[PDB]
């Protein structure tokens, strides 16, 4: 296990190579803007009737058609949603793949689960930032970066690891640290994390706490500040110092209450479920569920989106974030 | 209930008829090679850019395009995977179906569940061997055959039962015995058998026994011989003599231990599940699940294939079968 | 862990030695006939008022009285049922044991559990085939052999390991592979295997599946072919290629159904019982039960034998195996 | 199903034949005394150092040694305890068995479970009274008889059914009715009956009722009369008229209370246990337990005998039966 950083990487194997960034969404716009910041030879490939095309053009980028970018570039960096990467690849990318070319991703989903089968003679690597695309850029602008994983699925030029290292440094991931792993290990840990802790866990944790107080009769305005707003100020301490830096800044009264009560909230029942969530990922049951959600038309997902927006927490949340000027 | 054999069947209604065997896979190559052995007028219809096409050509068969074989033949025997039979039929078979033609299968899945709707005026029968395709041929080469079922879903020439009987004898199924049944009864018993006993049951049974000993600290090499390898030598006894022939050859110590302990392994809980497995088949819930696995891209199935290959039993299993020369 | 084979064994330490095979039952007749095939100096010791005595005499063997064979031979190979070995040894074998002689078995039951206490100055080894006696011979006739374990409990001539190796090669076990272990490990794994998987497991598995379909209203004749007869053709694939060779020959429909349903048949409850079955063996509770079954007159065992023979599966099983000529 | 009676049986096949009654216990003395009453040619075979020998001699019988009686008689009727019949048969009966002789029992235990294996050429029948031996005689003296079963396990003279019929009529069983059945069906129903209802059931039923009242504080003397003594006067009604004759003589208050409360005493739990008790008999588990009780020395049985005699019900029971003169 070796953690690559700035002093251990170079831009040698990308010095002289054109990189097509297919996409300009969360990560797409983020990574593309950063790569260009480092003085990297980048071309963005977008839809000509799509919205992001006008957005990448205003940002000062060489917007081109996906096919045109695909035919010109040496490296093809695919930054569109996973659920539609299989179609876009087979129709607007696969044809312009010549032996010696490199196909790179930021998530091993489509490769690992077999939705994209690359042709022989082509490099398959991954450069994956472990943060939301908006953070990836903002963290780069401040002079820092976000953690990144490097992976090689197919090495044909014998040059693949260096190529991915070069791109990782450009995106800024080398500032926080870069570790080499496999597509399988990146995809499985990423899905579990987002499901059990990063997106699923915290939201339900905050929701359960907010509604415990509201249904007890306390003000919804107070409940927001105490279960949701104050959370942002706490996690910063962990990010910079871990649990010890947080326990020291917080009062001893808060330290004793949290240490004794937390085993009761995250119980053994929740620990049992986290093990099952991981097994559904490992054996492809979640992927099957997610692929069928898309083929079915996202009725379940869209309905869940609508119910989330009708939560009182989001109403009182939005009203407080606007008056103080935290949300426009 | 009448069990047809060699002395009760004839090749009369197939004497003068061309038979298209669509496919050359497990059963495809098996049944086609046997039918020709009996001096039957067979044509194989394969893909021209596919692999099996070169394989059927080397075997000394009249390889032709599916459409060409379909237009020339009187009988169309479909031996490709069920999940893709619906598309191949509607595009490369249905057009060359003329009134008086016969459409035959070896499994009632696509017919019974409605994925293939034949046109009026056409015979619909089934000739189904109750064994893996590799065994179907090897059993024929030894001078024996495997059990077969005969079924008629649509009789238009009044000749359908004789046609299926003729083909069944050619494949060699008449040596072991042929019983007439319905598509529904063939499909439901076949799926249950393979799921609850033939493929699902034994594998999990062997796995649970292997890992009981390994985790107890005994050698994985010894555990293979005692839970898996010795199983092949035991089932032969049942195949030839049933439970009594096996109980007599095995020691009294093995007879008393198995008779008293087996109710504990296959318990009432497992008996309850076998009843539910059968009801999921009977009401089309398994078929719906299997059709969606394919539309979804087989991510779950392929992931299960990968986890199976990483089992220690398969590693130590493969190493012992190679050194002794049982697997090349 | 070293796996002995043909190229790693020799007949040196048995070249010049007489071997008494006490017994002519399943293993007795099997091993004795094979040892003689290899040009080994074998004498069979049987009862003069017993049936097998006439059977070994017809086979072209030097039938002699157990005592006579015991007094003449250097090696005494005991191939009679375990439950009666203790009496036969103390009365017709122990007296003719001279220092320097070797006492060999094919199962560690009587030695490990203390029912036979050998005298000092005598070699105690084991040559154990991991297959039913009928298979041991048939496998030898085909040019192959069955797996064997080698064990040394007492080495007095410093020659014991070579002696057992010599006999193992003669029986044909060296063709499949020979591994050295202890009496304890041979006896405990053998009993567990036969109880939980080889004899107990499969029979109850097949029974539960057969009766699920029959009580659902499907034909008993069809149920036999689909839960029992087709099993023999499936295990062959595992024997030669493991789970992967079987999954590939079977259809994808059978592969998906078995992979998803098997966890439900062999459940956690069955896994818990397999752990208890192993602990009853390890602490001598099964042996105590089996010894008391014999002292009590085998009323329970014989009653279980009678109920097994009245199963409908065995009736319909026997009728189908006779008409096709698989059972005379 | 034909119920033999007095008008359907004859003493033809026993007219001219000597019958050895081995034993003079409960049934032994009972059946022997009755057979002689009918003018039957009976010899009793007892131990010469045993007690019953002096008792049969005083009763006016031809007491002889078991061997002497065995060598003289044509029919050998074995009326000793089942647990010791196997030894007495092989040592004092088997030698005097000549082809054409008949071996008869009153219980199928030793035959059915294989503790006595008769020689070929000898008749094996059963004449079984369904009542305690004391009742068998007393019922005969009153001019009535007790129900009997007739069974044939081996017919060698073609005369076996007539022989058993002849003896059944002599014992008096033909007055109540004689039904032909198998050894298996006689033994299994007899053991279940005595275990679940006739001896086990009623005693525990009476015990539970007696101690319910005593521990509630009511007089033990009153509790005896109301739960135990009055039972004898109730069953007579059922014996002569069934449930309807009893319900009519008893008060409507007793009829309504018993009809509504009885489902609560004999519940579903007891019904589940009766099914298991029958399965332990059917598969020989009870027989194995009972054979081991004897080999072990009857310590458990004798201890249960001692605890029964220390019950307060038996103390207060005995005191009331003596003062009134019902027990000497
Ligand atoms: N999102 C994260 O924070 C995050 C974190 C780590 C890794 N990743 C991975 O990074 C990759 C990029 O995901 P993302 O969330 O950033 O994507 P995204 O925002 O969901 O995708 C938006 C972009 O995709 C384009 N697009 C959508 N459908 C298209 C189609 N049919 N043809 C062509 N272009 C199409 C859009 O163009 P138009 O304007 O024309 O519609 C737009 O440029 C994924 O593999 C994801 O797993 C994401
Ligand atoms: N497998 C058994 O042991 C078994 C037992 C009883 C009954 N059955 C039944 O027998 C039938 C045959 O199954 P199977 O397992 O033997 O088939 P299979 O081996 O899975 O199918 C392989 C064959 O299908 C061809 N094929 C695949 N996709 C095709 C496509 N899109 N167009 C044209 N040809 C295509 C392949 O040709 P290429 O070389 O060109 O790819 C190859 O010849 C099924 O209905 C099954 O349920 C099977
Ligand atoms: N059976 C297997 O497949 C298997 C697999 C591995 C290991 N083993 C082990 O191999 C050993 C041999 O078992 P086995 O099953 O092959 O034996 P078996 O068939 O049950 O024994 C039959 C033989 O024992 C003789 N015999 C029975 N009672 C006798 C007595 N009182 N005195 C003398 N000879 C007597 C019989 O002679 P008569 O003809 O005179 O009656 C006959 O020759 C055991 O230790 C067993 O655990 C067996
Ligand atoms: N008991 C019933 O009500 C009843 C109901 C139906 C059927 N049966 C069946 O009828 C049969 C007779 O049973 P039972 O209860 O009447 O017998 P039992 O009273 O228990 O046996 C007593 C008799 O057995 C003799 N005896 C005991 N041990 C002996 C030995 N070692 N050698 C020779 N004689 C010996 C005694 O002779 P000594 O005086 O010398 O000791 C005495 O004559 C059994 O098969 C039973 O199952 C009984
Ligand atoms: Mg992530
Ligand atoms: Mg993600
Ligand atoms: Mg099948
Ligand atoms: Mg199938
Ligand atoms: Mg074994
Ligand atoms: Mg064994
Ligand atoms: Mg009785
Ligand atoms: Mg009784």
Author numbering:
A (entry chain A), B (entry chain A), C (entry chain A), D (entry chain A): 2 to 329
Sentences copied from the publication:
The ketol-acid reductoisomerase (KARI, EC 1.1.1.86) catalyses the reversible conversion of acetohydroxy acids into the corresponding hydroxyl valerates, a crucial step in the biosynthesis pathway of valine, leucine and isoleucine. KARIs are structurally composed of an N-terminal Rossmann domain and a C-terminal “knot” domain. Here we describe the structure of the purified native dodecameric enzyme from M. thermolithotrophicus (referred here as MtKARI), which is the first structurally characterised KARI from a methanogen.
X-ray diffraction measurements were initially performed on crystals obtained from MtKARI purified and crystallised without any additional ions or substrates. In the obtained close state of MtKARI, NADP and Mg2+ are bound in the structure, even though we did not add any ligands in the crystallisation and soaking solutions. They therefore were natively co-purified from the cells of M. thermolithotrophicus. The structure of MtKARI in the close state harbours NADPH or NADP+ (later mentioned as NADP for convenience) bound to the Rossmann domain, as well as two metals coordinated at the Mg2+ binding site in structurally characterised homologs. While the NADP has a proper fit in the electron density, the suspected Mg2+ ions have a lower occupancy, especially for the second site, which might come from the twinning or a rather loose hexacoordination for the second site (site B). The first Mg2+ (site A) is hexacoordinated by Glu195, Asp191 and four waters, while the second ion (site B) is coordinated by Asp191, Glu231 and four water molecules with a far distant interaction with Glu227. The Arg48 and Ser53 selectively accommodate and stabilise the 2′-phosphate of NADP in the close state, similar to what is observed in SlaeKARI; however, the second stabilising serine (Ser61 in SlaeKARI) does not exist in MtKARI. A hydrophobic pocket contains the adenine moiety, several hydrogen bonds bind the pyrophosphate to the protein backbone and the ribose-nicotinamide part is bound by Asp83, Gly134 and a water network.
